[PDB]
């Protein structure tokens, strides 16, 4: 794209070859590993001998560069593994490795030892995804010692909210001062009883740590449990539609808080922070603000535009609530992205979408806004069930459409889980989107459109029509697909219009 | 042998639209001459249209528009440019000698035909002179200066209760639909091609407003529609409308620029299916009123209109053209029917089912009466 | 699509008892030139049509008008057909020659062609143009 | 995939594991010359090279290194004959991927890159040698393709040797040409003015007493065709309602000739040329198209336009016998995206897949299978149309439309014409760029200002025209695209004054 004046295509020019990355990367994986010539270094690990190529290893990992270019034909590695180093070599040559949960921590430590940065980051993310309560104080120890701030934050978030049952573990009792200071100064919830944790930690050796005890009290923060799953629906006979605010507990007792019961109508609601934002009124433009503890219906600025069946997605990164897609009362599918600011109460615009969709499902991903499915316009006068994945950035304000498409289509509901985008649709088939590596998985369900909400690390899938089969509220373990059934103590709904996560 | 009255004047075939212009008002004279050689006069009355006037013409159009059309002449061409450019009587509707005379002739023909129909003297009234269904209330468009079919429907409305308008012309009948877009006594059914075509109106979602809601049935299509598809789309909708609307007078605009290969034509319909459609509408023994309008290939227009006049009288006609002054004009096949072209249709069966089903839902909403 | 009294028509109201009074008062706005005769079969009409064609030069319209002028009486029409000269557009050979020259020089612009033929109105040269192109 | 679960086990497909290897090799393996294990010496100078990249990129070295002979296992191998500099360029290409091909040093690279089977460089050199064969080596590159089995160059160096057979006849190289090449050059339609019968007789006259009975084998295979390579001009004389269709014939004797005019009298808008006949959309209502014939001057009739549009782009495609129309404006200032294509043998107007972003008033350039929509204007949500800068590539074999990422250096109204692989572009504010789609790069070529320019390409040279005609010098510039040698031709008695359209 450079309008160079020196080169003339009839005398001389520079032949910029864009295919000279595939040929070498394929020639090495075909010629260098399948039948093993050109071997010039012999690395022996735990008795078994390897023949390897200093060129690729030194061109991919800097540690081997410092190794080979220092100042014998066979070199033995002290302690890695028989299988972990096999996987590492396979990744170095090919570029595909099968990460497993059983042999993950060793791969992480070794991949950081050999400075393979991409696999190190991938292992960091995958290990951050799989820390429930059991190793949350062992993984945290392997993050402070290893200088991986993102994993350190991810293993601290899941350890702060389980401080109650984590007190009695002897690993927490043998915890040094710095990590305790960093896990306490983050806003420990109210029900986790942090002061008793402080006293019990001191009670090990109180006569030696009594003067050191008050250093943590002068730094402890307190906050109330306000992680909710907002449910909105009518009872099919009353005009007013309620806003039951569930609270997810860890003792198999999902609690129900007070209702709000606004009385006009509800369409396209959303949740951000700890309060609820709803779109309603006789003319769908006025917006109410719901407060949980102080049950009130506050007022906010109305919608500046006119749309219906649009997608409201929350962005807590910049304290803004977006709105994408919709239908403009003339059966014309619009592509207009307006956002509202919480602290300023204004309704301004951004760039527009590429292909207009209506009635989709939107999922925030801490920096990118995902338009999932819905129905897209057809030049055949009508609307067909859409299947595209539309990306809307919020930091750079750019829009682009991903090439690959969903396995199904139609109306669908989406929610996220710690990196992912969980999807359910009509004719239950739970797929697990992953945007970083662009692949799909499936999770069968025991067989009515379903809804998905995320809280407390687990996923909760709801029904639309209740009529009491078992409980109509399924808790799903996303690891082993352990579909269990919760109580649903005295939910009196009948429709479940929207479920806000 | 049903009493059918016919209108024709010898002056309509002389008015010339200019060099390199699609619409040729000479076509009607050759259509009359083709009837003038088939013996169809012996079983059909022939009248002469009267020259129209102002007071019957101003019932719809504005006074200043009629004043301009009276005062226009090609001699002061470079003197009244503003009046031309406001009323859109410029390059899209060129001026010529006796433009208002042409309007008089067509208006008199159509209005007198309505006066014949409305008096229960003639059952089916045929007038190919008028049919100019693109002129709006105070501006010309689509080579149509004065909207004659609107005047005819207005005349029919003084005596009848509900008048149904049928549009087979390839263009959208926006002129008639614009005038009756609010009233509840006229249902206009128009089958028109609309991807980008003139005039660009006639969307599905425009059905009606005000008192006249669901009292305008528009129907888009796509290019290359063959005969069997057109029959399968024209039989159900018309039967449905005539079942739930119960009109007492049907004004059928028998367009002829939808045939196989006109200069502005885009469809692929033969004369046989067009005649089958009009016979279908005719088979309901209602007080009919035929109109013309459109048609931009003189040979095809003459053939189609002569076969339409034959089928309106229920008289079989030979395929071979007779001894006349137009031997080499109609050559080289010398036949009456037209073979279809090689255009590939772009309206699938599923699209047609969907559009028919949508129209059925729209028509189910008609209030019971 | 525009909505407003400056675009739509002012529909008249309906009166069920006014149809008969209005119907019989309006005139028949047209003059009759031909009507079918049931007692008059096709053979003698086909004969008389060629009769009018070959020796006297009558065309379709003028020959058929005379039949109704005498109320479908063929004999009286034969009696009076030579007495009425079927006045045509008198295109003399010179008129054809200058029309030929003018068409070649100027083309389809009949307003200019009127300049070399000032005695003929435009509605008359268009008819001769369409008849010549045969 | 149902087997993998993101919380138990899955496959890590790394898409960045092509950049890291290709950069590590060009950074670590070349800037300091380590890990060398084979020494290749060509013409005295000693090189240090790595067996891995060479054996993984060129199969010839794979066969040489992994052989069984004891000569290959010696540390230093000697290449018999390539060059000193050519092998330096080849090592630079194998390691980095960027080599500076020069016109003075191309044929050597062609033969050597074919010897080492580096097929990508071989194809690029084949194209770059197909670009620069004017007349002088047109019977020396032809012999370099028949000996190497590269039919594309063999066709591109026969097309440009057939159309110059008159002047080529006297050259002694043409006289020493074997039978097969002469049979393949004659049997493809030698032009009428080249005197092929004189050429075949003069070829025999070298040794006639030995090849006399051998002569008539080719006279029974000679094909003859008339010169019909034109540059069509359309423009009204600013005072007459009829717009003519002057048909220029491009000759090689510095005498560009003018054939008979056509002078249609309705109006001209958005015309196209295909084969040897001109197509034009026109009339008072812009829907009917006329088909002009060159020798027999007649205005035939064709199938009218099925849709309504203006300022669209008519693009010719002789590959599948079609005339494409793309973009346009739709009578209410709405820019439409829809391509209807016409067939000459059927006179039918069908549709195809629609464009991605609607453009109007653009310039289209055929590329023997790809139709390029260059520039024009695109819609803006601020009720307006801005001068567009997008390169829309509309395929014609698979029927997929996609938008290329990079953009032009300028924007607005523009005219484009192709030259042997390229898409030359000119616009207001004269600045001649040279598009190249295969490797997606531009160049520039300044023009002598001392008025929108029009481009038509014929006979290998590029002729640029003016809009306003008032006689500066000749207002018709013959441009040599190699050295930017802008010369001025005659324009013998052109009476044009506006030059609405110039058709390549
Ligand atoms: O004399 P006009 O009524 O103005 O019409 C003529 C006539 O067409 P019609 O038969 O439709 O009247 C010509 O037809 P022929 O006499 O050759 O059969 C036709 O010529 P084409 O056959 O080439 O269409 C010509 O068209 P053009 O002016 O493009 O040559 C067209 O003239 P208009 O375009 O002025 O109507
Ligand atoms: C019964 N009937 N059937 N078809 C038509 C008909 C009538 C007119 C046109 C037409 C079809 N197609 C056309 N295409 C164009 C090209 C164009 C495209 C996009 C933007 C601008 C121009 N311009 C037309 N008219 C111009 C427009 C300005 C106005 N002052 C009159 C002159 C017409 N009438
Ligand atoms: Zn029409």
């Amino acid at each position: 794209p450079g309008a160079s004046m020196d080169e003339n295509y009839f005398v001389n020019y520079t032949f910029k070859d864009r295919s000279h990355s595939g040929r070498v990367a394929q020639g090495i994986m075909k010629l260098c590993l399948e039948e093993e010539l050109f071997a010039d270094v012999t690395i022996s690990v735990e008795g078994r001998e390897f023949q390897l190529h200093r060129l690729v290893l030194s061109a991919q990992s800097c540690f081997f560069r410092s190794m080979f270019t220092s100042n014998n034909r066979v070199i033995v590695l002290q302690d890695v593994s028989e299988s972990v180093f096999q996987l590492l070599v396979d990744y170095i040559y090919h570029g595909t490795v099968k990460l497993r949960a059983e042999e993950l921590q060793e791969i992480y430590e070794v991949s950081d030892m050999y400075q393979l940065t991409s696999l190190f980051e991938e292992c960091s993310r995958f290990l951050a995804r799989t820390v429930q309560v059991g190793n949350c104080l062992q993984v945290m120890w392997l993050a402070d010692r290893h200088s991986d701030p993102e994993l350190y934050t991810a293993a601290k978030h899941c350890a702060k909210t389980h401080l109650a049952q984590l007190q009695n573990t002897e690993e927490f009792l043998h915890l040094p001062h710095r990590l305790l200071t960093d896990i306490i100064s983050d806003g420990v919830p109210c029900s986790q009883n942090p002061t008793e944790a402080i006293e019990a930690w001191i009670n090990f050796n109180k006569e030696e740590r009594e003067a050191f005890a008050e250093s943590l009290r002068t730094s402890l923060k307190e906050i109330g449990e306000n992680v909710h799953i907002y449910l909105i629906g009518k009872e099919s006979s009353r005009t007013h539609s309620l806003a039951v605010s569930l609270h997810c507990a860890e003792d198999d007792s999902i609690s129900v808080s007070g209702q709000n019961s606004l009385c006009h109508q509800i369409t396209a609601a959303c949740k951000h922070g700890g309060d609820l934002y709803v779109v309603g009124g006789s003319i769908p433009r006025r917006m109410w603000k719901c407060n949980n503890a102080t049950v009130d219906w506050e007022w906010c600025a109305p919608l500046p535009r006119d749309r219906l069946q649009h997608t409201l997605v929350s962005v807590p990164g910049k304290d803004a609530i977006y709105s994408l897609g919709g239908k403009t009362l003339q059966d014309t599918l619009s592509n207009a992205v307006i956002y509202y600011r919480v602290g300023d109460n204004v309704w301004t615009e951004t760039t527009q979408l590429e292909v207009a969709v209506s009635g989709a499902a939107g999922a925030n991903l801490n920096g990118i806004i995902y338009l999932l499915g819905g129905e897209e316009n057809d030049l055949d006068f009508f609307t067909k069930p859409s299947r595209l994945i539309q990306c809307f950035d919020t930091e750079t304000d750019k829009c682009h459409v991903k090439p690959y498409v969903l396995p199904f289509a139609g109306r669908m509901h989406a929610a996220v889980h710690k990196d992912l985008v969980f999807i359910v649709a009509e004719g239950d088939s739970l797929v697990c989107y992953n945007p970083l590596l662009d692949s799909f998985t499936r999770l069968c369900l025991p067989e009515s459109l379903w809804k998905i909400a995320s809280c407390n690390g687990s996923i909760y899938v709801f029904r639309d029509r209740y009529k009491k089969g078992d409980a109509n509220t399924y808790k799903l373990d996303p690891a082993t697909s352990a579909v269990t059934v919760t109580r649903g103590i005295k939910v009196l709904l009948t429709n479940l219009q929207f479920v806000l996560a | 042998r049903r009493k059918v009255c016919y209108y024709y004047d010898g002056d309509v075939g002389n008015y010339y639209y200019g060099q390199g212009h699609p619409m040729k008002p000479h076509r009607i004279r050759m259509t009359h001459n083709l009837l003038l050689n088939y013996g169809l006069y012996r079983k059909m009355e022939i009248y002469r249209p009267h020259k129209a006037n102002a007071e019957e013409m101003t019932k719809y159009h504005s006074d200043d528009y009629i004043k301009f059309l009276r005062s226009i002449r090609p001699d002061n061409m470079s003197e009244y440019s503003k009046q031309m450019q406001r009323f859109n009587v410029g390059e899209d509707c060129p001026v010529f000698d006796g433009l208002f005379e042409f309007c008089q002739l067509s208006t008199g023909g159509s209005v007198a035909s309505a006066v014949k129909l409305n008096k229960q003297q003639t059952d089916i009234a045929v007038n190919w002179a008028g049919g100019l269904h693109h002129a709006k209330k105070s501006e010309a468009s689509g080579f149509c200066y004065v909207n004659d079919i609107v005047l005819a429907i207005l005349e029919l409305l003084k005596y009848h209760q509900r008048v149904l308008y049928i549009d087979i012309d390839i263009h959208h009948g926006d002129g008639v639909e614009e005038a009756f877009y609010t009233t509840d006594r006229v249902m206009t059914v128009s089958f028109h091609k609309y991807g980008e075509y003139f005039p660009g109106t006639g969307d599905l979602r425009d059905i009606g407003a005000g008192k006249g809601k669901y009292y305008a049935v528009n129907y888009p299509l796509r290019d290359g529609i063959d005969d069997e598809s057109y029959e399968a789309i024209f039989k159900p909708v018309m039967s449905k409308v005539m079942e739930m609307f119960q009109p007492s007078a049907v004004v059928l605009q028998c367009g002829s620029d939808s045939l196989s290969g006109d200069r502005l034509g885009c469809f692929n319909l033969t004369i046989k299916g067009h005649a089958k459609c009009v016979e279908f509408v005719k088979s309901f023994n209602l007080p009919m009123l035929m109109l013309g309008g459109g048609g931009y290939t003189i040979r095809n227009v003459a053939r189609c209109w002569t076969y339409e006049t034959a089928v309106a009288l229920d008289t079989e006609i030979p395929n071979e053209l007779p001894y006349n002054d137009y031997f080499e004009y109609f050559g080289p096949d010398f036949k009456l029917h037209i073979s279809p072209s090689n255009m590939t249709n772009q309206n699938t069966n599923e699209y047609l089912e969907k559009i028919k089903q949508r129209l059925f839902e729209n028509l189910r909403m008609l209030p019971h009466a | 699509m525009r909505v407003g009294p400056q675009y739509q028509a002012v529909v008249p109201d309906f009166d069920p008892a006014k149809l008969a009074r209005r119907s019989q008062e309006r005139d028949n706005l047209g003059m009759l030139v031909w009507s079918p005769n049931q007692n008059l079969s096709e053979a003698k009409l086909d004969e008389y049509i060629a009769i009018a064609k070959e020796k006297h030069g009558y065309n379709m319209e003028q020959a058929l008008g005379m039949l109704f002028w005498h109320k479908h009486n063929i004999e009286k029409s034969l009696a009076d057909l030579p007495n009425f000269t079927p006045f045509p557009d008198e295109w003399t050979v010179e008129d054809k020659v200058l029309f030929e020259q003018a068409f070649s020089f100027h083309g389809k612009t009949f307003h200019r062609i009127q300049q070399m033929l000032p005695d003929k109105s435009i509605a008359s040269l268009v008819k001769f143009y369409y008849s010549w192109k045969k």
Side-chain angles (χ1 to χ4, degrees), chain B residues 59-103:
Chain B
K59 171 64 62 64
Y60 177 71
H61 295 283
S62 67
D63 321 66
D64 46 15
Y65 191 81
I66 306 302
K67 182 131 162 173
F68 173 8
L69 288 183
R70 194 101 51 71
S71 300
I72 189 55
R73 198 176 296 108
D75 79 34
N76 51 3
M77 192 66 278
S78 66
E79 192 274 334
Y80 266 147
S81 65
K82 149 71 152 195
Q83 294 298 106
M84 161 175 18
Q85 75 190 358
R86 144 45 173 281
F87 283 19
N88 201 356
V89 202
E91 68 275 20
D92 210 7
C93 309
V95 281
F96 38 80
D97 53 318
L99 165 60
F100 198 94
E101 294 178 357
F102 181 78
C103 296

Side-chain angles (χ1 to χ4, degrees), chain C:
Chain C
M1 267 296 265
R2 279 86 62 197
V3 177
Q6 71 272 19
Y7 291 109
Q8 289 95 30
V10 177
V11 287
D13 291 331
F14 179 80
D15 195 1
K18 171 54 158 292
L19 40 66
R21 180 173 293 172
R22 269 183 182 171
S23 62
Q24 295 179 355
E25 286 175 352
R26 300 182 76 200
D27 291 329
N28 288 316
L29 267 296
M31 52 89 88
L32 202 149
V33 290
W34 180 254
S35 179
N37 190 5
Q38 299 178 357
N39 294 318
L40 190 61
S41 187
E42 296 172 355
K44 54 212 161 303
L45 302 188
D46 292 331
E47 187 180 359
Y48 176 82
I49 287 168
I51 293 170
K53 276 186 174 182
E54 293 177 354
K55 34 182 181 303
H56 294 79
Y58 279 166
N59 58 357
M60 269 324 120
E61 187 180 2
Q62 293 172 354
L64 267 310
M66 267 323 134
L67 258 295
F68 185 73
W69 181 255
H70 305 289
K71 264 172 291 293
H72 295 91
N73 190 0
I74 292 175
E75 296 179 355
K76 157 142 290 306
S77 185
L78 305 145
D80 289 331
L81 69 84
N83 292 316
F84 289 99
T85 60
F87 295 105
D89 285 331
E90 289 184 353
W91 282 93
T92 66
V93 184
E94 294 89 357
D95 288 332
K96 332 202 144 57
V97 174
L98 300 62
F99 190 78
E100 198 37 66
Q101 294 176 359
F103 178 83
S104 178
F105 278 114
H106 293 85
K108 310 317 191 63
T109 163
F110 292 101
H111 178 71
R112 292 179 180 177
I113 301 172
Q114 188 189 6
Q115 290 182 355
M116 291 38 66
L117 291 179
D119 54 349
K120 277 178 181 64
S121 69
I122 322 92
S124 325
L125 316 83
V126 278
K127 153 158 180 63
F128 185 80
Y129 163 100
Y130 282 104
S131 181
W132 151 31
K133 214 164 61 74
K134 303 174 180 177

Side-chain angles (χ1 to χ4, degrees), chain B residues 88 90-93 134 141-144 171 197-198 257 264 294 296:
Chain B
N88 201 356
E91 68 275 20
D92 210 7
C93 309
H134 284 278
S141 176
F143 315 114
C144 298
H171 308 96
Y197 206 88
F198 184 48
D257 53 35
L264 321 183
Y296 298 115

